[PDB]
Amino acid sequence: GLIYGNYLHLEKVLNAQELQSETKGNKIHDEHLFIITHQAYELWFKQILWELDSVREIFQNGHVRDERNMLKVVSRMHRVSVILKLLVQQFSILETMTALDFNDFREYLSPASGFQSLQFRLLENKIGVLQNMRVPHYRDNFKGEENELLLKSEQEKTLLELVEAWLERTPGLEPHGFNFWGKLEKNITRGLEEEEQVAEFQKQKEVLLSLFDEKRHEHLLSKGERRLSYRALQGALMIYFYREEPRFQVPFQLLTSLMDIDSLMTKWRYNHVCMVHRMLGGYHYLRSTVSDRYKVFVDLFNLSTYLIPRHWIPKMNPTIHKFLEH
Amino acid sequence: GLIYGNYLHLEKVLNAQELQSETKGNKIHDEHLFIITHQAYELWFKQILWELDSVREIFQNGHVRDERNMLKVVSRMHRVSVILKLLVQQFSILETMTALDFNDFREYLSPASGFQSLQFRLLENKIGVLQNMRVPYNRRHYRDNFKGEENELLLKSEQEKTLLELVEAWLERTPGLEPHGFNFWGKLEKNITRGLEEEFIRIQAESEEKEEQVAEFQKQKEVLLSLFDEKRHEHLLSKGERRLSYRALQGALMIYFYREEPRFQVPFQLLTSLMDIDSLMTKWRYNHVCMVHRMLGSSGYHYLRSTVSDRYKVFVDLFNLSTYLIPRHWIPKMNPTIHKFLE
Amino acid sequence: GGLIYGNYLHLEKVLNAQELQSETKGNKIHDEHLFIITHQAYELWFKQILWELDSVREIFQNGHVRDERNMLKVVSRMHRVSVILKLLVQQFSILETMTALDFNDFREYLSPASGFQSLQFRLLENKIGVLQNMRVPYYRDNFKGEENELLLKSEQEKTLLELVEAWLERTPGLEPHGFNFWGKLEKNITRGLEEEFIRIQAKEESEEKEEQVAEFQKQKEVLLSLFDEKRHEHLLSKGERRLSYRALQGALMIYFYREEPRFQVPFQLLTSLMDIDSLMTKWRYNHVCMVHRMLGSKAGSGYHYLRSTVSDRYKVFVDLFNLSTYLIPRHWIPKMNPTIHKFL
Amino acid sequence: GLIYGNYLHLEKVLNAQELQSETKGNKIHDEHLFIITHQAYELWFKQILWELDSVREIFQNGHVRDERNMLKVVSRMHRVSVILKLLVQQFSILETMTALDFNDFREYLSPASGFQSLQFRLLENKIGVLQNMRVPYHYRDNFKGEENELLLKSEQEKTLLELVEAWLERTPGLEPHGFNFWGKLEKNITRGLEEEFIRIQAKEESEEKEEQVAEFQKQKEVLLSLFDEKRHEHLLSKGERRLSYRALQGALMIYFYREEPRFQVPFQLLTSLMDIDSLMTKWRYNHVCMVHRMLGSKSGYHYLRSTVSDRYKVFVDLFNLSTYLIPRHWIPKMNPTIHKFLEH
Ligand code: HEM
Ligand code: HEM
Ligand code: HEM
Ligand code: HEM
Ligand SMILES: Fc1ccc2c(/C=C/c3nnn[nH]3)c[nH]c2c1
Ligand SMILES: Fc1ccc2c(/C=C/c3nnn[nH]3)c[nH]c2c1
Ligand SMILES: Fc1ccc2c(/C=C/c3nnn[nH]3)c[nH]c2c1
Ligand SMILES: C[C@](N)(Cc1c[nH]c2ccccc12)C(=O)O
Ligand SMILES: C[C@](N)(Cc1c[nH]c2ccccc12)C(=O)O
Ligand SMILES: C[C@](N)(Cc1c[nH]c2ccccc12)C(=O)O
Ligand SMILES: C[C@](N)(Cc1c[nH]c2ccccc12)C(=O)O
């Protein structure tokens, strides 16, 4: 029957290590570490793509509508975070290579770099990094079937788009139902008004009431300083404020997980930068990838700006408590 | 021009994922995670073998004799423990797979397992796990699972000099052991004999806290003086409860007690690193067990639990040197001649 | 002057709690400072774990757990406990930067204190549900006064194991006149085994066939043992099992039907309880691995007693781990008809 | 006889938890986690200060001159980075608190913050963050009395940067009358660049060749700038550099000749100082990433983001030595006399 080595196709995995330094008759020991490290990163990127495409598909084929599938969705998105956490720790292995030892084989690599990682771009695109928000261009490095896959990843529905659609259908937003948005505007307005001192309040008032300016939201959307439809934003805040309601518990975990993935991607970018500095003394472009420009779910972070006292949150009457009960 | 994908042979690495569940028309999502996890472990085992063989070679060809090479030796052995640290953390990824989800594809894997990891055995053997000290699985040797060129490589790895043997040889040549030189072992026996005598006197100044100190002293005396019983050491060597030659043990303790001496600083770091590698291997074995329990309940789970013992710690002697630690003022002083040899 | 960082955090206490016994007897040893801070950091986190754990115990004990609105809070806090324990396992890495030789220079001045006298560690063991007669010999003698009194309360008050057990007994779907999970499961496993024995007895007499019969008979014994309530009571009294028969049924109900909305977060809770058992035993194991490096095969048996705490004798939720033994093909799990899909 | 609780002054450590929310009759559960987390950070800051002051002292009192002490110095500086690694991971515990739950007790804290952490500032100062490298938002104003006095001493007493600089200036091999590292290096880089210009001007006239000439001329300008002591003084005063020209020479001597016995542990020390800078900035970055989650864009979040720059890396010079790496065969060879000087 089946043998470990054959099951895992180790005849491919463990015969993929060719030191360019050796191939030009000057073998450098540490180049082996450089190769395995990248290969391990690429195995895990493939796994992240596998989880991510499976989750994209659960939204796209409508299975997400059946709430029995939310445990699967949150598990796999959580799994992506656990993988990314290891990829952040994995830099510690490559930091055991000194700049001097790297310098002895660096010449033999030119002009290859992570800029040519197909999977890293697929991953960025599939989460929902938009091309016009990227700092300088990126797809020039790719040709043939790879250039074609990269296009599909920009055109096919992103995780951001599929989550946006789902967030728009959040229960409680219906004006002739719970009418969350109307009640919230009323309750914040009635709050506030319950007002030589600081009089900072005017700052708080401007910020909170700006939430209800749909026009400001559309302007900021088109400048790419926000990413979610106004209606998706309402669903997210509905899930935040009413997270203890049974039907919102796992959805709240999902929103938390999406923010975790943004955090860990940017931590990956930051640990990469911190190491490129040590190796080369490039370094400036990477530093500019560590900004909110590249956080696909920045809207979910910025909802913290619009937190209010508990007693302002529109109360749930027995009818709507029962709608949000499994 | 060279291309990232081509440099890394990603045409092999990223086309090595075949789900047996899919191959029999019932694809299970989590089987993909099962495969990548093993492949990642196997890439890192290959890297550990690369570091380990490079270090074995530096001892075997005599380069280690030139002390300028100790930074390289300690860096690579330290690198091995950083990789093992990640491999211990890597179990956390496979723990995101539930036993229920694993159960949906387990059938399609039979009868393969990690028992057939060639690299894991090469790694155990090359560090210096002895075949006769291994726990048997279903009353058989671990090498039955392998045939042909793989069985042959495993044999070479048992017969070729292990890291334990090469470190032992190097430890035997440690400066300061020469009876007609510093004579570390003679001075130490004298100073421990004197130190114990001074301690007995301080105590024979009665109470019940005093009586519990006499019992403790008599225990400490028996243990410390047993160090100088070369006969007991040879007996324990042959029972495999110890691994290093008596002379290698002397070198190790020389490096421990005189670690601040310039020529002993990096050697001390190396001994610390060898213990780190033993600790992290056993942590790997323990995290593997803790997870097999969660996935299966059951014997596999019992044999693995028995691999988490001092039977499998190749450098157990370096841990057990802590038993024979003594107060600072007992350690034989270094006169200006021998300070200068180590500086 | 309103509120000040130092005052808010009572840093006048926290940062004036470091007294090196080596210094107090006129022979200051540098690394003793690290020994003290490391233990103090462990004890701050033990206090936090007790805070989360007592809050969760209380939500079960006062009946608030019955309102499923509260399960997000319960799973968050139990998850938080395992995140803290993960850091406590990593925290050993700091104390491993102390050599055995450096430890040996101040060890004398500590006698006869040890972690055996950690009140909070015992409170934590007791409150999760470590049972007194399953503790390895060479524990309460070390403690006196109001500490001895708190330890007693922790043994007498309802443990997390007891409170989870009670809640697991009320799991929906166990009612014989309802979904009748246990009856349907016995029927489906009994039928499934019968179908499998027939598929096997068809095969032409061989050696591969006989090794399948031996494998089948093993599987049959294990699965059908689930329905032996008497075996379960015997194993309960030997302390090889901890959950009531009915609590075991609820746990397996939640395992098999975890995707059902009402079971999703409860499944996460069961997962978290197993995580806490895993991380406690990892804490015990990393402690052992380090005591070996510091003391060798010397007393404090020491290194040997600790090694015996790293067993399933100390896993409070062993029953949750061992449910993996009784996993069955998917198509054997009793189907949910539209009526019971709607209840969950 | 000594008791665990008493040895560790747990009567202080575990009675330092006062929830302001409870003190104003509205107890919020998660405030307890907020307090323990900060107290654990502050215990570890105290330990880092203990290691750091002990190492400062070994330089300041001349013990560092005796190379017997390098193992101690590197162990303790390595210990600092292991502690900082845990402090970076420790953010994961506070990330188990949601912004909503934080918001329920945030009001009761005003206007206290980490800006009032005495130990964080002592730590920044003692490593060698200077006044003129700080982003402006007068950090000292928050402190009064004996705390203001400690902060002053930390600015005035010799920093780790100053003490390392002094030691690096005495590095063997820099003496013009001896190995004369700097002279030989200028000669070998000048010769090496000449050989390289020739190898390039030989190549078949092309566009790939012209892009190599532009690359060479860039590399030549950068390498030769190393020997411009005037450019170094200019960059020192603009705070783009921190180390004396002579200290920089010692560092590069240790980099290129690290395998020489007397340089092995010194190389580890330089590596460790870079590790400490990396982990401090990772601490600053994980703090920022979490303040974002808790507060949004409310400056605050913007000032912290500006602390995550090379302006706060005290040993940025040690990172930037990688800019001046050269092929192995250009490094001045060591004759038998100087091989013997760098032998323990
Ligand atoms: C010594 C180690 C490393 C150095 C010095 C290094 C250096 C760099 C530099 C300078 C860049 C900017 C592009 C360029 O100039 O070519 C870059 C980009 C990149 N590197 Fe690396 N790298 C290293 C390791 C890694 C590893 C292990 C990975 C894992 C796959 C990786 C993935 C990437 C990716 C994905 C990019 C594109 C980044 C983006 O566009 O956001 N690098 N690297
Ligand atoms: C769901 C995950 C896993 C399960 C259920 C599992 C199960 C087992 C079992 C039962 C054994 C004992 C031999 C046998 O009866 O099969 C074993 C041994 C082993 N497994 Fe795993 N394993 C898992 C994951 C891994 C992974 C990811 C590795 C990575 C290399 C691995 C490496 C090994 C090795 C090397 C052995 C032989 C160990 C020894 O003899 O000391 N396993 N495994
Ligand atoms: C150098 C470090 C350490 C050494 C050598 C050490 C040694 C020991 C020993 C020998 C015991 C068994 C009882 C005895 O003979 O006195 C013990 C128990 C214990 N230690 Fe430690 N220990 C260390 C660090 C720590 C730390 C940092 C903690 C943190 C709280 C800790 C907590 C405990 C606890 C709670 C016990 C009771 C264990 C049980 O019954 O399951 N130890 N330690
Ligand atoms: C929910 C958790 C936290 C929030 C929201 C938070 C927020 C902030 C903010 C806004 C500042 C800037 C000063 C101000 O405008 O008041 C700050 C600075 C600071 N925080 Fe935090 N913080 C948190 C947790 C922590 C923790 C756990 C520590 C642990 C010691 C800490 C240490 C500091 C330090 C030292 C500063 C001064 C930073 C500098 O000058 O570079 N913070 N924090
Ligand atoms: F490549 C492989 C193949 C099978 C297993 C395995 C199987 C364990 C097992 N349990 N029951 N049957 N096999 C554990 N790791 C593996 C790696
Ligand atoms: F607060 C304390 C005091 C002593 C110890 C200790 C002593 C262990 C020991 N080994 N040999 N003698 N004492 C281990 N953890 C501790 C914590
Ligand atoms: F002792 C304290 C008190 C408050 C804070 C804090 C508050 C930050 C903040 N932002 N908005 N309101 N409070 C961050 N670290 C702290 C330590
Ligand atoms: C029927 C539904 N599953 C409802 C839904 C939409 N968005 C949500 C967010 C949280 C909870 C629920 C929902 C659906 O429309 O998909
Ligand atoms: C010349 C020598 N390198 C000496 C040697 C042997 N073992 C040691 C331990 C520590 C320091 C040195 C040694 C050699 O014989 O290898
Ligand atoms: C009404 C109920 N909350 C029902 C209950 C008990 N255990 C469970 C496990 C999963 C889902 C639900 C339950 C109660 O009695 O607590
Ligand atoms: C005698 C000496 N320890 C020499 C010294 C200074 N900096 C160094 C760096 C590496 C090796 C040595 C040194 C001293 O002058 O302190």
Side-chain angles (χ1 to χ4, degrees), chain C residues 5 8-10 13 15-16 18-19 30-33 40 43 47-48 51-52 80 97, chain D residues 4 7-9 12 14-15 17-18 29-32 39 42 46-47 50-51 79 89 96:
Chain C
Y5 185 89
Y8 175 53
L9 299 174
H10 286 291
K13 300 194 182 180
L15 303 183
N16 290 303
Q18 293 79 36
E19 186 199 320
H30 177 81
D31 274 13
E32 191 183 1
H33 199 281
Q40 296 173 329
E43 291 286 342
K47 189 161 167 157
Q48 189 62 40
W51 181 264
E52 299 302 340
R80 173 178 296 171
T97 68
Chain D
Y4 181 89
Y7 174 53
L8 297 174
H9 285 294
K12 302 189 143 164
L14 301 182
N15 287 308
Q17 294 79 36
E18 188 185 318
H29 177 79
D30 275 12
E31 189 184 1
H32 198 279
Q39 294 174 329
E42 290 288 338
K46 187 161 172 159
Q47 186 64 40
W50 179 268
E51 298 305 337
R79 172 178 295 170
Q89 284 152 10
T96 68

Side-chain angles (χ1 to χ4, degrees), chain B residues 68 260 262 265 269 343, chain D residues 67-68 259-260 268 344:
Chain B
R68 76 185 308 280
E260 300 204 273
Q265 292 178 348
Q269 290 172 346
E343 182 247 6
Chain D
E67 292 169 26
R68 292 180 70 268
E259 300 197 271
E260 296 303 308
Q268 290 170 348
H344 307 295

Side-chain angles (χ1 to χ4, degrees), chain B residues 67-72 74 78 89 209 259-266 268-269 328 339-343, chain D residues 1 66-72 74-75 78 89 257-261 263-265 267-268 328 339 343-344:
Chain B
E67 297 181 358
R68 76 185 308 280
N69 290 313
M70 289 303 304
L71 182 67
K72 181 176 285 179
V74 168
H78 177 253
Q89 285 152 10
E209 192 184 293
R259 62 196 187 278
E260 300 204 273
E261 295 304 309
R263 268 178 88 206
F264 288 158
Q265 292 178 348
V266 178
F268 179 72
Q269 290 172 346
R328 250 183 149 184
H339 266 293
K340 194 87 218 158
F341 194 51
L342 303 180
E343 182 247 6
Chain D
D66 191 356
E67 292 169 26
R68 292 180 70 268
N69 293 119
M70 287 304 303
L71 183 61
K72 182 175 289 197
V74 169
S75 295
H78 178 250
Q89 284 152 10
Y257 301 111
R258 62 198 188 281
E259 300 197 271
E260 296 303 308
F263 287 160
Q264 293 177 348
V265 178
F267 181 70
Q268 290 170 348
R328 250 256 252 284
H339 268 291
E343 269 179 28
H344 307 295

Side-chain angles (χ1 to χ4, degrees), chain C residues 3-6 8-9, chain D residues 34 38 102 106-107 109-116 287 291 295 298:
Chain C
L3 195 55
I4 294 165
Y5 185 89
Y8 175 53
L9 299 174
Chain D
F34 191 80
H38 285 90
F102 178 50
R106 178 169 162 249
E107 58 178 279
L109 299 182
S110 219
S113 78
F115 237 82
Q116 290 159 257
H287 177 245
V291 175
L295 297 188
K298 187 205 326 300

Side-chain angles (χ1 to χ4, degrees), chain B residues 15-34:
Chain B
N15 289 306
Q17 293 80 36
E18 189 194 323
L19 279 72
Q20 286 303 119
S21 69
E22 190 169 357
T23 290
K24 329 254 161 156
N26 183 35
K27 171 167 144 203
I28 305 305
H29 175 84
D30 277 16
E31 189 186 0
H32 197 281
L33 180 66
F34 191 78

Side-chain angles (χ1 to χ4, degrees), chain D residues 322-333:
Chain D
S322 296
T323 303
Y324 309 103
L325 298 186
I326 67 194
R328 250 256 252 284
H329 75 275
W330 298 17
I331 294 162
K333 291 222 134 79

Side-chain angles (χ1 to χ4, degrees), chain D residues 70-101:
Chain D
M70 287 304 303
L71 183 61
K72 182 175 289 197
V73 167
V74 169
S75 295
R76 291 185 186 176
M77 292 313 288
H78 178 250
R79 172 178 295 170
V80 163
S81 57
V82 174
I83 296 171
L84 286 164
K85 215 128 34 169
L86 190 85
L87 298 192
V88 171
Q89 284 152 10
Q90 192 164 288
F91 280 113
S92 76
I93 289 164
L94 204 49
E95 279 162 4
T96 68
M97 185 178 62
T98 72
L100 292 314
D101 291 304

